[PDB]
Amino acid sequence: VPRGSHMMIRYVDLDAAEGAALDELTRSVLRDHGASSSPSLLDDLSLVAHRMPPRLIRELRRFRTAEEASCLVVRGLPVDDRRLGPTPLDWREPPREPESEVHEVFLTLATAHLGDIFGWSTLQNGRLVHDVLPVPSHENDQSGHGTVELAWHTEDGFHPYRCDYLLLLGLRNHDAVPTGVAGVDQVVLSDEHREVLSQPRFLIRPDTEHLRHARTLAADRGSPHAVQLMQDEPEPCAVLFGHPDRPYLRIDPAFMSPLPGDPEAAAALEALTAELQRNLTDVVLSPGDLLVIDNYRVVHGRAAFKARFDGTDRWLKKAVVTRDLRKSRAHRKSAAERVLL
Amino acid sequence: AVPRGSHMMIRYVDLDAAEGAALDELTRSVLRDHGASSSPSLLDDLSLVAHRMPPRLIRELRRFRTAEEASCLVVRGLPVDDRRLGPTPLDWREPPREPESEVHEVFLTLATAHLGDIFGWSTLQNGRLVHDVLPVPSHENDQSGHGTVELAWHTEDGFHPYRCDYLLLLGLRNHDAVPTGVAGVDQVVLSDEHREVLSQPRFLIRPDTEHLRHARTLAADRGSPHAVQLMQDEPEPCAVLFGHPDRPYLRIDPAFMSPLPGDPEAAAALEALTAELQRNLTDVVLSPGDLLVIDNYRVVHGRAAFKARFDGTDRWLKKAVVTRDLRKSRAHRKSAAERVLL
Ligand SMILES: NC(=[NH2+])NCCC[C@H](N)C(=O)O
Numbered sequence: 018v019p020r021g022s023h024m025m026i027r028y029v030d031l032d033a034a035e036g037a038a039l040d041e042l043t044r045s046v047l048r049d050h051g052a053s054s055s056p057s058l059l060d061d062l063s064l065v066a067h068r069m070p071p072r073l074i075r076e077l078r079r080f081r082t083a084e085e086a087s088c089l090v091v092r093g094l095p096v097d098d099r100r101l102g103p104t105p106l107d108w109r110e111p112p113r114e115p116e117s118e119v120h121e122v123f124l125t126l127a128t129a130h131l132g133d134i135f136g137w138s139t140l141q142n143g144r145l146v147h148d149v150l151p152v153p154s155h156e157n158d159q160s161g162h163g164t165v166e167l168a169w170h171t172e173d174g175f176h177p178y179r180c181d182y183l184l185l186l187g188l189r190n191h192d193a194v195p196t197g198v199a200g201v202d203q204v205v206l207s208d209e210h211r212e213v214l215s216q217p218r219f220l221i222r223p224d225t226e227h228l229r230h231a232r233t234l235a236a237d238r239g240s241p242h243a244v245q246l247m248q249d250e251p252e253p254c255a256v257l258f259g260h261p262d263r264p265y266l267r268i269d270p271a272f273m274s275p276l277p278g279d280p281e282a283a284a285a286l287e288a289l290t291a292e293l294q295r296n297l298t299d300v301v302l303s304p305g306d307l308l309v310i311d312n313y314r315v316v317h318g319r320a321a322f323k324a325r326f327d328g329t330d331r332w333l334k335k336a337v338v339t340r341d342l343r344k345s346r347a348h349r350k351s352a353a354e355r356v357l358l
Numbered sequence: 359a360v361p362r363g364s365h366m367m368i369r370y371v372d373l374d375a376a377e378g379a380a381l382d383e384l385t386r387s388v389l390r391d392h393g394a395s396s397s398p399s400l401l402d403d404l405s406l407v408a409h410r411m412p413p414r415l416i417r418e419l420r421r422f423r424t425a426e427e428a429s430c431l432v433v434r435g436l437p438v439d440d441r442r443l444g445p446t447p448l449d450w451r452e453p454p455r456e457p458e459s460e461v462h463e464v465f466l467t468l469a470t471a472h473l474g475d476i477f478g479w480s481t482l483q484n485g486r487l488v489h490d491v492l493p494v495p496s497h498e499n500d501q502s503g504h505g506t507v508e509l510a511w512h513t514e515d516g517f518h519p520y521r522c523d524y525l526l527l528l529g530l531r532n533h534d535a536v537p538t539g540v541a542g543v544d545q546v547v548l549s550d551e552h553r554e555v556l557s558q559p560r561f562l563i564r565p566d567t568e569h570l571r572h573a574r575t576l577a578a579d580r581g582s583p584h585a586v587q588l589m590q591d592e593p594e595p596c597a598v599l600f601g602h603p604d605r606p607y608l609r610i611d612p613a614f615m616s617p618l619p620g621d622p623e624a625a626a627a628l629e630a631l632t633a634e635l636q637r638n639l640t641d642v643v644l645s646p647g648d649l650l651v652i653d654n655y656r657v658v659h660g661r662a663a664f665k666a667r668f669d670g671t672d673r674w675l676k677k678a679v680v681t682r683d684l685r686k687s688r689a690h691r692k693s694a695a696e697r698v699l700l
C-alpha cells in the first residue's frame with residue numbers, strides 16, 4: 018500500500034444478449050418462486066444463480082476471490098422506468114407496480130456468487146432486500162432515507178458481524194445523485210498511525226436507524242437487545258485489521274470516537290479520515306447499475322439532494338452479504354435463519 | 359434443542375448409475391483440461407465447473423451446509439476401479455504408480471465448491487489442497503492419518519481458530535473394512551453445569567505432532583518462529599462449547615489438550631463430555647467411492663486400529679478441508695488470494 022486510483026473501481030458492461038437473458042431469467046424465477054425472498058428460491062439459490070450469463074458469474078467470483086478492485090460496477094441490466102412505476106414514499110409501503118421485485122431477484126441471485134445473503138431484525142422488518150429511498154420525517158437522518166449529505170462509513174461498522182459485501186442496484190436516479198466511495202488500499206498513512214489504528218483504541222456505535230427499532234424490539238420481547246448494549250457499552254476495537262501490510266477497514270466517523278484521554282488515537286483517526294475524504298470518488302448509479310462494495314476495504318456515502326415525494330425520487334435496491342453466516346449463530350434464532358435478532 | 363436422536367446424525371445419499379457415470383466422465387475431462395486437481399485454472403473457475411455436477415448431488419451438498427440437520431453426509435456410488443487405481447503409495451510424498459487417483463481428487467475439489475472455500479496448511483503435506491490418508495512405515499504409532507494404532511477422536515485441527523468448517527474424506531481402498539468413528543455434539547447428554555464450564559475459556563488445545571514437525575522446519579527456513587509453534591508453547595485459553603448455548607458448536611482434541619491447571623471443574627466437565635462422546639461414537643466404513651462430509655463444528659471423528667502390510671493393498675483415502683470464510687485467516691496467509699495458511 019498504497020495502490021493507484023485506477024485499481025479501485027472495475028467496470029463491467031453487459032451486452033444486449035446478456036441483459037436480455039438476465040431480464041428473462043429474473044422474471045421467470047420470480048414467477049416460479051413467488052418472491053425474491055422465497056424459501057424455495059433461497060434453498061436452491063446457488064443452482065438458480067448459475068443460470069445467469071457466465072461472464073457475470075466469472076466477474077463476481079473473481080471480484081470476491083482476487084480482491085483487486087474494491088468496487089465492482091456492472092451496467093446494462095434492463096430497467097423500464099414506466100413499468101417500474103412511482104417510487105414508494107416509505108419502505109413500509111408496497112410499490113404500485115410489482116416490477117421492482119424482478120430486479121430484487123437479480124440482486125438476490127448476484128449474492129449467491131459472493132456469499133450468504135442476510136438481514137437485520139432492526140432494519141426494514143428483517144427484509145433480505147432493502148429499499149433505498151427518501152422518507153418524510155427522516156430528511157435530516159444519517160441513513161439511506163435521508164436527503165442531507167450521508168457521511169461516508171463502513172456499512173454497519175459497529176457490528177462484528179457486519180457484511181463483507183454491500184450491493185446497491187440503481188432503479189431510479191433522475192438527478193444523478195452520486196454515491197461516494199473511498200478505498201483503504203489507496204490511503205497514504207504513516208507507520209505510526211497504522212499501528213495505533215490497528216489497536217483496540219476506538220469505540221464505534223450503532224446508527225440512528227438500528228437504535229430506533231432495537232428500542233421497540235426490546236419492548237415486544239422480554240430481553241434487552243444486543244444493538245442497544247453496543248450503544249451503551251461499546252467494546253473497544255481496531256479500525257485497521259487483517260494483515261498489517263494491506264489491512265482491512267472498520268470506520269464510521271458520525272457514530273464513533275477514540276478512547277477518551279487518548280490523543281495519539283485521535284490524531285491517527287483524523288489522519289485516516291482526511292485521506293479517505295481526499296480520495297472520495299463519485300459513482301452515479303443509473304437505472305440498471307449494480308455497485309458491489311467490499312465492506313472490508315471501502316467506505317461509502319451519498320451526496321445531499323432534494324426530495325420531492327411525488328413518485329419520481331431516487332430509488333435503489335440493496336442487499337448485504339456475509340461470507341460466513343455461521344459466525345453470527347449466537348445472534349440468530351436457529352442455524353438456517355438469515356436474520357440477526 | 360439438545361439432545362437429538364442418533365437417527366438424525368448421519369444422512370445417506372446413494373448415487374444412481376447415471377449420476378456415477380456422469381461424475382466419472384466430468385472429473386476425467388476436468389483433469390485433462392486443467393492439468394491437475396489443484397490447478398489455478400480450475401480453482402479460479404471452480405464454482406462454474408462444480409455446477410456441472412449432477413443437480414441432486416449439488417442440492418444434497420448445499421442443503422447439508424445450510425440446514426445443519428444431519429452432521430455427517432455419506433454419499434455412496436462414485437465409480438472407483440481398484441485395478442486402474444494401482445497400489446496404495448507408501449507415503450504421501452511418493453507419487454502414485456497410476457495417475458487414476460487424481461481423477462477422484464477432482465471429484466473432491468469440485469465437491470468443496472458447494473460447501474465453501476477449499477484451503478490448506480503449509481505445515482501439512484507440503485501445502486497440498488487434497489491430502490492422502492494412508493499408513494506410512496515408521497508412523498504406525500502416530501495419532502495421525504498415517505498411523506495404524508487407534509486414532510483417537512477429535513475436532514480436525516481443533517487447536518486452530520481458523521480450523522476447517524467441513525472435512526471431506528473419500529474412500530479409495532479399504533479391503534479390511536476399517537471403520538471411521540464419528541460422534542456429534544447434538545446427540546450428547548450433558549448437565550447445564552458442565553455446559554457452562556465448557557463454554558468458558560478454561561481449556562488449552564495444542565497442535566498435533568504432524569503440524570509441529572513441519573512448523574519447526576519452516577521456522578528455520580523463513581528465519582522466524584512459526585505461528586503453530588507459538589500455539590504449542592503458549593496456547594490461548596478457549597471454550598470447548600461455543601456458538602448458541604441452546605445448540606452449541608464443539609471444539610475438542612483429547613490427545614492434544616488439557617484443562618487449565620488447578621481447575622477441577624474444567625477437568626470434570628471435560629471428562630463428562632469426553633465419556634459421552636465416546637459412548638455415542640458410531641462406525642462408518644468408507645468403501646471405495648464413499649464420500650463422507652463431516653461438519654467439523656459439530657462432529658468429532660476417529661479411526662479404528664488396523665494392521666498395515668505396506669504391500670500396496672493398504673487403506674487409502676483422499677481428504678480435503680473447507681472453510682466457510684477464507685478471509686478470516688488473512689493475517690496468517692501470504693496474500694488475499696493464497697489458499698494455503700503460512
Ligand atoms: N453512518 C452510517 N452508519 N450511515 C448508514 C446508516 C444506514 C441505516 N442503518 C439504514 O438502514 O438506512
Ligand SMILES: NC(=[NH2+])NCCC[C@H](N)C(=O)O
Pocket residue numbers: 482501502503504510511512513514515516566568569611613614
Ligand atoms: N488428535 C488429532 N488431532 N488427530 C488428527 C491428526 C491428523 C494429522 N494432522 C494428519 O495430517 O494426519
Ligand SMILES: [Fe+2]
Pocket residue numbers: 171172173317
Ligand atoms: Fe451505507
Ligand SMILES: [Fe+2]
Pocket residue numbers: 513514515659
Ligand atoms: Fe482428523
